[PDB]
């Protein structure tokens, strides 16, 4: 997925979408390519426990410091656990091995915090119709980069609150601007019709972030 994403991003960036003729960005919009999932909220407690996040469907996940994962489905009880070796187990909050008591308790804390505080990213978006989990993430001075198991890469910029949701399957990018307005574009159509320098710059940055993901797999 990452290699495909890199090729898609390289292709759009090489077309110099903001540096040519009349920009027809609107013609690159494709609402059918809207993502099914993205990260609506996140909490970095990696100093001790890990990275907690909420997906737009109100499900929650934690990527713990020991590289294990716990995912709570939006029914508020069903759980999936993923061990280091990749083994996937299914359980509930009420019915679980005693060995998972601490991790389940931690997820509860993350969940409650993200239910009580913080804004839902993409709240105004209608998602497209087995949950993806957080494969890996990292932060830079300017952004947090979240790589989902379905191939999607989300980049949230800290300073201006703008966001990209990249999907290599749709070969598309969803851009959320400073006003929380959103558009989904087909990357090949951005090559065809161009885009503003703001989106173009963020796509150049996205390529460098994908390079980091690929070189640190």
């Amino acid at each position: 997925h990452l290699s495909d994403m890199l090729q898609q991003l390289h292709s759009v960036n090489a077309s110099k979408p903001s540096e040519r003729g009349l920009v027809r960005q609107e013609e690159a919009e494709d609402p059918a390519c809207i993502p099914i999932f993205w990260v609506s909220k996140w909490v970095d407690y990696s100093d001790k426990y890990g990275l907690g996040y909420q997906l737009c469907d109100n499900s929650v996940g934690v990527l713990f410091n020991d590289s294990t994962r716990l995912i709570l489905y939006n029914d508020g009880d069903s759980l999936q656990y993923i061990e280091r070796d990749g083994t996937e187990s299914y359980l509930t909050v009420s019915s679980h091995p005693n060995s998972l008591m601490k991790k389940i308790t931690l997820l509860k804390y993350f969940r409650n915090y993200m239910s009580e505080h913080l804004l839902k990213a993409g709240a105004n978006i209608t998602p497209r119709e087995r949950l993806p989990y957080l494969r890996t993430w990292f932060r830079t001075r300017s952004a947090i980069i979240l790589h989902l198991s379905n191939g999607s890469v989300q980049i949230n910029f800290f300073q201006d609150h703008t966001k990209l949701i990249l999907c290599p399957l749709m070969a598309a990018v969803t851009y959320i601007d400073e006003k929380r307005d959103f558009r989904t574009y087909r990357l090949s159509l951005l090559e065809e019709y161009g885009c503003c320098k703001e989106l173009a710059s963020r796509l150049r940055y996205a390529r460098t972030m994908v390079d980091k993901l690929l070189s640190s797999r």
Partner: peptide, 5 residues
Amino acid sequence: PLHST
């Protein structure tokens, strides 16, 4: 930031 908006 240690958490989202």
